[PDB]
Design a protein around this ligand. Structure first.
Ligand code: IK8
Lengths: 52, 234
């Protein structure tokens, strides 16, 4: 079910284009090489509780 | 916040507090970026002059991470009206950038379509603030957070004495004694997805707090994402 099926396996945003899932991230994140995971570009990325 | 628990160290880093001249909070806000705060438009009618404090969890002590910021620009939605509380949204641009650190970090702005299908369909959202802890009591000196269920739109419209427009949504409990309250207005309503929190609403209003058969009414952020994008340039 694409994006309906476990968020299309995306860490964040999921889009259905040509019966294919397309993952994307929030500002401040970089889509990982697998095209699914979102990696923080710098310190204190949005949406993350602070640990340090 | 009625019920719920304290925000522990680093748990609600996106919480902002609008403070008046007497240096006391009267509303909340959400950190969107180093320069922008998201709050309720109706809060701009609660003080002639105000600033924004971030990184605070206890108003009685100096936890060291607190930082007060002067507002450079107030961007209130022109369609807001206190007659209906519709379009209860505003963006504040700070004069100096917020330096992120422990207890000071932004919440993520989601994309509308994804947020409405995935985030707003989750069982719950998280609301937080320094507002009243009971309808007839005082504002808390401690930042609280509360997990609030998304409420069925029909149910909530039936429960309201006032019109729930397309820019509002309900969250909270029918009878359970937990709810946002006076003073939390303008504060964050975020939804957690895979350990990342996205802004989904703005504390707006409610007929009392934690009253039986009443829900907390929030501004539907996903309906203003394009508006927020544009405001974050003014
Ligand atoms: C101004 N008129 C026209 C009434 C109106 N028209 C449309 C909506 N409303 C409307 C109804 C009730 C309220 N009145 C509160 O909003 C309120 C009063 C108090 C108390 F403590 F009683 F003074 N507390 N609130 C409050 C604030 C933020 C909240 O977030 N979630 C909640 N349940 C909640 C509750 C309002 F602020 C606007």
């Amino acid at each position: 079910k694409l994006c309906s099926l476990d968020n299309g396996d995306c860490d964040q945003f999921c889009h259905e284009e040509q019966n294919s899932v397309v993952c994307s991230c929030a500002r401040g994140y970089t889509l990982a090489d697998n095209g699914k995971a979102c990696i923080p570009t710098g310190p204190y990325p949005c949406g993350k509780q602070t640990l340090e | 916040i009625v019920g719920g628990q304290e925000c522990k160290d680093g748990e609600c880093p996106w919480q902002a507090l609008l403070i008046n001249e007497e240096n006391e909070g009267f509303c909340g806000g959400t950190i969107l970026s180093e320069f922008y705060i998201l709050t309720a438009a109706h809060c701009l009618y609660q003080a002639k002059r105000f600033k924004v404090r971030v990184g605070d969890r206890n108003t009685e002590q100096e936890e060291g991470g607190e930082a007060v910021h002067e507002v450079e620009v107030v961007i209130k939605h022109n369609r807001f009206t206190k007659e209906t509380y519709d379009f209860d949204i505003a963006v504040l641009r700070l004069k100096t950038p917020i330096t992120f650190r422990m207890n000071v970090a932004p919440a993520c702005l989601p994309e509308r379509d994804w947020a409405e299908s995935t985030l707003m369909t989750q069982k719950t959202g998280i609301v937080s603030g320094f507002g009243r802890t009971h309808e007839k009591g005082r504002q808390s000196t401690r930042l609280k957070m509360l997990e609030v269920p998304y409420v069925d739109r029909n149910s909530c419209k039936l429960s309201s004495s006032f019109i729930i427009t397309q820019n509002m949504f309900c969250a909270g409990y029918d009878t359970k004694q937990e709810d946002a309250c006076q003073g939390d207005s303008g504060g964050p309503h975020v939804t957690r997805f895979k350990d990342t929190y996205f802004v989904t609403g703005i504390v707006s209003w409610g007929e009392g707090c934690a009253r039986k058969g009443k829900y907390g009414i929030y501004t539907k952020v996903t309906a203003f994402l394009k508006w927020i994008d544009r405001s974050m340039k003014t």
